[PDB]
Amino acid sequence: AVPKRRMSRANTRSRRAQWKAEAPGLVTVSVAGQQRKVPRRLLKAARLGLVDLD
Amino acid sequence: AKGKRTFQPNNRRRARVHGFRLRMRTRAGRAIVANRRSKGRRALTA
Amino acid sequence: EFPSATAKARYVRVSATKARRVIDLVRGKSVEEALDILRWAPQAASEPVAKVIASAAANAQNNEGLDPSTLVVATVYADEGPTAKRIRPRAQGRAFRIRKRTSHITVIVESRPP
Amino acid sequence: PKPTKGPRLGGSSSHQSALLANLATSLFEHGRIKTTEPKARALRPYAEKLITHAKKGALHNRREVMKKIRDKDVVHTLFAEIGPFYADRNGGYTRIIKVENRKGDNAPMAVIELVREK
RNA sequence: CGCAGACCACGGGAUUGAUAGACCAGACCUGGAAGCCUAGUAAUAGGUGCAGGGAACUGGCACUAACCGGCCGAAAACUUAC
RNA sequence: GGCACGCGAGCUGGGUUUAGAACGUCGUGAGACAGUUCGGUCUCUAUCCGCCGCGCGCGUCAGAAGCUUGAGGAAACCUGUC
RNA sequence: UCAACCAUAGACUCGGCGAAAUUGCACUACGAGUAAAGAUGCUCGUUACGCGCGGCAGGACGAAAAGACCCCGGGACCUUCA
RNA sequence: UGCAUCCGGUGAAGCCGCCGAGUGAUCGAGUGGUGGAGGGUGUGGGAGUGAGAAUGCAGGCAUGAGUAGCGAUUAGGCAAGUGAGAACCUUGCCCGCCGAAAGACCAAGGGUUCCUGGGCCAGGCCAGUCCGCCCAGGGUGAGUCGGGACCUAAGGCGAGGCCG
RNA sequence: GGGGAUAAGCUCCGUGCGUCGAGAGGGAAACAGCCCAGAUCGCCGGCUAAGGCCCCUAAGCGUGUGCUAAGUGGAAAAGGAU
RNA sequence: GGAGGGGAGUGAAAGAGUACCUGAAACCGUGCGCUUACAAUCCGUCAGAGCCCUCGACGUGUCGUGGGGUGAUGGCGUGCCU
């Protein structure tokens, strides 16, 4: 089908504000004497030397 | 399944039909040149 | 009125909305933390923003001699730049208009002691 | 092993089975492989069962392995080294390790290893 | 991870552990494996032998993974009656 | 019996009502018949209200976890033979 | 009758590129009624926490096409002892 | 624009304004910011002389929407590689598809698309170190091949000519 | 007054009759033509019309004498009934 | 990585950077103040609480021949043109 009206500013921006993003929950790692912040999902793989840390 | 469009190109045909010689072969087809030759054209006839 | 440093990025190939989707995370986050968030973000607009933020921090360090850990991402905004048109074709002899968008991106980092 | 609960892994049971066999081949050939996650989740059990056949070594176990993987170098590898090497470890030969996602489609990725601790 | 489920939600567990997968055993489905031996001209049949194989059901086993962790989240007072 | 003789952005398309064709009757003729006869494209990604379900947020004068009362609403309500 | 189960392409979730027709407005309920005689917008009452997601398709006399049936005006083409 | 006078790089117009005015169309020779060269006043003259609507024209930008789709019924994968950056680019081993075709050779047609080197802000329905994309350079060799210089059909043009 | 069924928000005529058209404001629950009244602009002044004075809604659950028992008031006929 | 940018410079001015005189509106966003999650809104108008900014007369903060932005709540109120 097809809309019928020019859906307003309020409604538009309101719903548009649901299309957002969340940030992964970060955690320290003692990468060879120094520290970097990495998700928890990848913690073991970092401590074992696979994660490409730039 | 017949999607045969109108323009199956050829060139000998193009020139024996829409060509210079066959424009100049008559009277009406010269005047077709006299407008194009005056209007400002570049490719009077293929 | 704390000492600031500025950084821009112009004629970038990411639509501004898909930039703002990320920037909402880091308005107010510290520099280091934002850089990391953006390293580990699943969005394809995180890398330009990363480059801009580290650029501003670097300009603050070199050109205005500031400590890199007293910093925050104070003000950020992405805006719409030019727009290029492409007549992409479609059925029944119709032709619709893609608009390839771009975006400018602007960062201003203060230097805030606690 | 426990079948896929939903739709399959590359577009059919055929392609699924072929894919699992190629990946077990590569695994036993190298020791690590990096692949998207549900493939690993689907490839722990398959591979552990092939390994168990290797442990309980025999003509019959060997043929019932060769009727999947199609690579004699890799079956020789199993029955020569990987079989006895995992004698006493009763169960649990593989390991999964998640890693950085993939650029093209954000898809998960995981490195599946064989353990080496006994 | 689930017999909960469009995603999210819901339910359980999270080394002070049997949640899942594997492994051992069992139940059930199929129906008498391969190899060797024998009889046969050969097709093939018989023995070893409820054999072997195998997915969800069940009991056990900590062998692999459940991590050496991040984030949210708590008190203006005021009057009568007491 | 009603609700666009309920309901085609839900389905059909036999009829009726496009172009083809034929019979009867009228018309000199083109052609016509609330006469007949065989055939004949049914387009749309649901913006809003509405409705069935499901979430996020905030609230109920501190923050939280369990057990629940019941205003008010819904579902069910059929019948027979020896 | 009388429908049930399975697999693939979609549909749903995630990452990327990214249009469309349509559009007077807008923080757009229901009823009985009134009215250019079928009311989201008026009256009088009843109900409803803000914002979203999947899905259905009753209405918005929904979108499309300055009606193709009818009538008027102008043309066109066809006919005939005009 | 005719005529007379006034302001103007010691900052006109135009634009954003604030403060104010007129019964109204409107006004500020009242002042700030921006900005950089012409304007105002009174009287007369002349008008392409005032737009909110023409299913109006041209350009730009929104809602729908960060939604539908991303072009078949063959199916992709692992290691290594250079690279800033790899689901797709190069190689290795697998795997799978067509196999009177989805294979090899010509005609029409198109016109450098071919090779090498370099390149990736545009394009490819994503990205791309890749490409029929971009740039430069290079490259097509005929006594016997398909045509002409050899011949003619359909048909064409048509000296003279006949008709008009 | 005609036509009509002495039906139509029907149709057709008359009318120094009206209003709407071109006419706001008040009352009529909302309501172009009904009743009142014909808007030069302002005032945080007063008196009145139509209509109305229990609350919603500003003004009287006003005074006096009688009826109503039907929620008449706040639709209705032929006819029936101490 | 490069695009692009920040300093240093040129220049009278880089609010003249080869996307370049001026540089409007629609449109797109960032900050600051008020307001908004028990409510039925042609989106306004009349009254107006409360808070925030400002000018002025004064006095330790304070009303005013004030002015401006928002504006809870109440009444009234049926888009523009043809």
Domain containing residue B34: 1-46
Largest Cα separation within chain A, whole Å, is: 63
Total of domains in chain B: 1
Paired strand residues for C5: C109
Paired tokens of B33 = 């040149």
Q: Work out the number of other CB atoms within 10 angstroms of the CB of residue C19.
A: 25
Between CA C92 and CA C84 the distance in angstroms is 25
The two counts, helices (H) then strands (E), for chain C are 3, 3
Between CA C11 and CA C78 the distance in angstroms is 11
Which chains would you list as touching B if contact means 3+ CB atom pairs under 8 Å? none
Going by the DSSP 8-state scheme, the letter that residue D60 receives in this structure is H
* Any A CB within 8 A of D100 CB: yes
- Angle (CA) D99-D100-D103 rounded to 5° is 140
Buried b (16+ CB within 10 A) or exposed e, D106-115: eebbbbbbbe
Dihedral, CA of residue A42, residue A45, residue A46 and residue A49, to nearest 10:
-160
E36 C1' to D51 CA distance, Å = 27
Question: Cα Rg for chain D, rounded, in angstroms?
Answer: 15
Paired tokens of C4 = 């600031």
Please state how this structure was obtained. Answer: cryo-EM
Please name the residues in contact with D37: beta carbons below 8 A apart, sequence gap of 6 or more. Answer: D98, D107, D108, D109, D110
Nearest to C15 by CA among C70, C69, C58, C78: C78
Give the dihedral sign, CA C78/C82/C86/C90: positive
Total of domains in chain C: 1
φ, ψ at A34 (rounded to 5°): -120, 175
Paired tokens of D33 = 């492989």
Per DSSP, the residues of C49-112 read HHHHHHHHHHHHHHHH---TTSEEEEEEEEEEEEEEEEEEE-STT-EEEEEEEEEEEEEEEEE-
The pairing of strands A34-39 and A26-31 is antiparallel
Q: Report the CATH number that the domain containing residue D85 is assigned in CATH.
A: 3.90.1030.10
| Element spanning D22, H or E | helix D13-30
Paired tokens of D79 = 């029955």
Please name the residues in contact with D20: beta carbons below 8 A apart, sequence gap of 6 or more. Answer: D9, D39, D42, D43, D46
Q: Work out the number of other CB atoms within 10 angstroms of the CB of residue C31.
A: 21
* Any D CB within 8 A of A1 CB: no
Burial environment of residue C78 by CB neighbours within 10 A (0 to 12, 13 to 18, 19 or more): buried
Domain containing residue D114: 1-118
Give long-range contacts, CB 8 A cutoff, 24+ apart: B35-40.
none
Strand ranges in A1-54 using DSSP code E only, listed in sequence order: 26-31, 34-39
Between CA C7 and CA D104 the distance in angstroms is 29
Which chains would you list as touching A if contact means 3+ CB atom pairs under 8 Å? C, D
Helices (H), chain C: 16-26, 31-39, 46-64
Between CA B8 and CA A51 the distance in angstroms is 60
Between CA B37 and CA A44 the distance in angstroms is 82
Between CA C80 and CA C92 the distance in angstroms is 33
Paired strand residues for C85: C99
Residues 73-102 of chain C sitting with CB below 7 angstroms of strand H: 80, 83-86, 88, 99-101
Query: What size, in residues, is chain D?
Result: 118
Residue type, B7: F
Going by the DSSP 8-state scheme, the letter that residue C14 receives in this structure is S
Dihedral, CA of residue A9, residue C46, residue A31 and residue D31, to nearest 10:
110
> C64: helix, coil or strand?
helix
Q: Report the CATH number that the domain containing residue B13 is assigned in CATH.
A: 1.10.287.3980
Total of domains in chain D: 1
Please name the residues in contact with C29: beta carbons below 8 A apart, sequence gap of 6 or more. Answer: C37, C72, C73
Paired tokens of A8 = 């307003």
Paired strand residues for C79: C104
Residue type, D24: A
Protein-covered nucleotides of chain H (CB closer than 7 Å) are 60-67, 75-79, 85-88, 94-96, 108-110, 121-124, 126-127, 157-158
Contact A36, C37 (CB under 8 A): no
Give the dihedral sign, CA D74/D76/D81/D85: positive
